[PDB]
Amino acid sequence: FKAGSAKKGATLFKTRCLQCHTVEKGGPHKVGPNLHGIFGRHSGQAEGYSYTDANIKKNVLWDENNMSEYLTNPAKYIPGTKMAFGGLKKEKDRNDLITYLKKASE
Amino acid sequence: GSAKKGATLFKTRCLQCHTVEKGGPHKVGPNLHGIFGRHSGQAEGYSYTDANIKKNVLWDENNMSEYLTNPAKYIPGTKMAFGGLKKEKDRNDLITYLKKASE
Numbered sequence: 311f312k313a314g315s316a317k318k319g320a321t322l323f324k325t326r327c328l329q330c331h332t333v334e335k336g337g338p339h340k341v342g343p344n345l346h347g348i349f350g351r352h353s354g355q356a357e358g359y360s361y362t363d364a365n366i367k368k369n370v371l372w373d374e375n376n377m378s379e380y381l382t383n384p385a386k387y388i389p390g391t392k393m394a395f396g397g398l399k400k401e402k403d404r405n406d407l408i409t410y411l412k413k414a415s416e
Numbered sequence: 417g418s419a420k421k422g423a424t425l426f427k428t429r430c431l432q433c434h435t436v437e438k439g440g441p442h443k444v445g446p447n448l449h450g451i452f453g454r455h456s457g458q459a460e461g462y463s464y465t466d467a468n469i470k471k472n473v474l475w476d477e478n479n480m481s482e483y484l485t486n487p488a489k490y491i492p493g494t495k496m497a498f499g500g501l502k503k504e505k506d507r508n509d510l511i512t513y514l515k516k517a518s519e
């Protein structure tokens with residue numbers, strides 16, 4: 311987590327972020343919020359855009375390090391991603407499903 | 417465990433992509449007959465993503481319950497969907513700009 315290239319910088323952010331984010335001061339919102347000064351300004355706190363209620367469980371402002379963890383799997387925090395392919399949040403639900411599945415599949 | 421509530425969970429949450437009876441067809445996901453006590457990625461007639469190659473398990477109730485807390489994280493490309501980058505020297509490459517363009 312030190313430095314990096316700038317020319318692939320514009321490319322990588324254009325390859326993987328431009329579709330959902332702008333950055334320049336006063337930039338428009340997209341499907342995702344504009345990122346002007348994402349440091350200092352607390353996380354999930356861009357005016358003109360209210361977030362999913364995931365910002366309420368995890369919200370410590372990003373830095374050079376702990377944000378890099380967010381770009382490993384940002385979808386982990388987007389709501390409905392668990393449920394998509396059969397995710398069950400409640401353990402009693404997983405218990406009941408596994409109870410049924412053990413007998414139905416054998 | 418209520419198998420009665422489990423049946424209803426499977427009907428509304430899993431049946432859209434899986435069958436469970438012996439000889440059942442594959443759908444978007446594989447037929448689940450015999451899943452317990454076999455390894456991930458082994459249903460006959462279904463060809464899987466590469467997820468199970470490096471994440472291989474012998475299905476039991478412990479790892480099934482863990483898996484079912486979040487199956488999407490093993491679907492290849494779900495992490496990339498919202499800006500996931502795999503290799504460490506690529507996040508480090510582009511957060512150092514994210515500090516520049518903030519200014």
Ligand code: HEC
Pocket residue numbers: 323326327329330331341342343345348352353354355356360361362363364365381384388497498499500501514
């Ligand atoms: C569309 C699929 C997106 C892509 C590609 C990327 N991001 Fe994203 N991001 C998106 C949304 C819809 C949201 C909001 C989530 C919510 O709960 O409302 C976000 C959020 C962020 C944040 C948090 C900003 C804050 O105000 O705290 C950051 C820092 C962020 N996104 C950065 C980011 C980067 C660097 C990306 C390229 C690797 C990227 N996102 C891709 C939508 C999408």
Ligand code: HEC
Pocket residue numbers: 394395396397398407411426429430431432433434444445446448451455456457458459463464465466467468484487490491
């Ligand atoms: C479509 C949107 C799905 C829903 C809804 C559920 N599952 Fe699924 N499942 C799906 C796919 C495409 C795959 C294969 C993934 C791959 O990497 O190829 C799977 C896999 C499973 C497995 C593993 C199968 C095996 O190893 O043979 C299990 C045990 C499983 N799925 C169970 C399951 C349950 C219990 C669900 C309801 C809670 C459920 N899945 C929903 C696609 C989809």
Ligand SMILES: C=CCCCCCCCCCO[C@@H]1O[C@H](CO)[C@@H](O[C@H]2O[C@H](CO)[C@@H](O)[C@H](O)[C@H]2O)[C@H](O)[C@H]1O
Pocket residue numbers: 353354361364365368369370376377379380387
């Ligand atoms: C708009 C939405 C923005 C949502 C904000 C999410 C920001 C979180 C990014 C990672 C920073 O969070 C930091 O890493 C993980 C993620 O929970 C936490 O710990 C984690 O460790 C393990 C990983 O080895 C995980 O399995 C655990 O579930 C988690 O507790 C740390 O306690 C926290 O210090």
Ligand SMILES: C=CCCCCCCCCCO[C@@H]1O[C@H](CO)[C@@H](O[C@H]2O[C@H](CO)[C@@H](O)[C@H](O)[C@H]2O)[C@H](O)[C@H]1O
Pocket residue numbers: 456457464467468471472473474478479480482483490
């Ligand atoms: C085919 C498509 C999907 C492929 C991707 C499958 C990914 C599922 C992985 C879910 C992680 O679940 C995890 O499985 C491991 C290994 O089996 C379990 O490990 C545990 O049971 C194993 C049984 O020998 C032993 O290693 C120990 O008892 C313990 O490590 C974890 O306690 C469980 O928390």
